[PDB]
Design a protein around this nucleic acid. Structure first.
Ligand SMILES: [Mn+2]
Ligand code: NA
Length: 191
DNA sequence: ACTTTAT
DNA sequence: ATAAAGTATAGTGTG
């Protein structure tokens, strides 16, 4: 099974949507009977939004006096998953451990303090986690500084190997992969 | 490498 | 006027 790890840039715009969905505040493949089974791995406050959480965090810690730019990348949302088969082999304890382990890799490489949320969805087709990493470093907020072409290449080699080192049996994706990413809607048509 | 942004 | 950070990026799956 391949390690699936992919990030999306999140602004003020789409963080409201991310928050209202990630909390189950519908889609055909959501089983509402199972939504009570989702869980959150950070110890964030359920009732505070992501925008409000991150904006306060950055402002309260940033070296510069200047305002966060309207078009700033407030966080990079990483989807952490694999395929059906992969999870089929694991029980509840181990599935939880898998996501905590991935969360760790991101804590250790980019700061435990920058994991805004870590939201595990067991009510869709395949267990996955929506994990918000705030690109904040040296008192500066910059996705550009933190996740560049090389960092993404690096993660594709390094994350899967770090997972396997903790007893999880997944291989890295195809190097120089030709694939274009499809949005979830696009990918459903494809099957 | 070039534009937008907030100074 | 200046300069940091905006633009994608790397990967596979029904996020
Ligand atoms: Mn989900
Ligand atoms: Na220009």
């Amino acid at each position: 099974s391949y390690m699936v790890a992919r990030m999306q840039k999140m602004k003020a715009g789409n963080l409201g949507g991310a928050f209202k969905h990630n909390e189950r505040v519908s889609n055909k493949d959501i089983n509402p009977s199972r939504s009570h089974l989702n869980y959150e791995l950070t110890d964030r406050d359920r009732s505070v939004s992501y925008e409000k959480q991150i904006k306060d965090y950055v402002n309260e810690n940033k070296v510069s006096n200047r305002a966060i730019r309207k078009d700033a990348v407030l966080c990079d949302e990483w989807i952490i998953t694999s395929d059906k088969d992969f999870f089929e082999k694991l029980d509840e304890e181990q599935t939880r451990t898998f996501f905590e382990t991935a969360k760790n890799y991101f804590a250790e490489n980019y700061g435990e303090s920058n994991i805004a949320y870590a939201s595990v969805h067991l009510d869709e087709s395949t267990p996955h986690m929506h994990m918000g990493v705030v690109p904040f470093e040296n008192g500066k907020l910059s996705s550009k500084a933190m996740f560049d072409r090389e960092e993404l290449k690096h993660i594709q080699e390094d994350l899967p190997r770090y997972m396997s080192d903790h007893g999880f049996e997944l291989e890295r994706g195809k190097l120089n992969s030709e694939a274009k990413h499809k949005t979830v809607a696009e990918f459903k048509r494809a099957m």
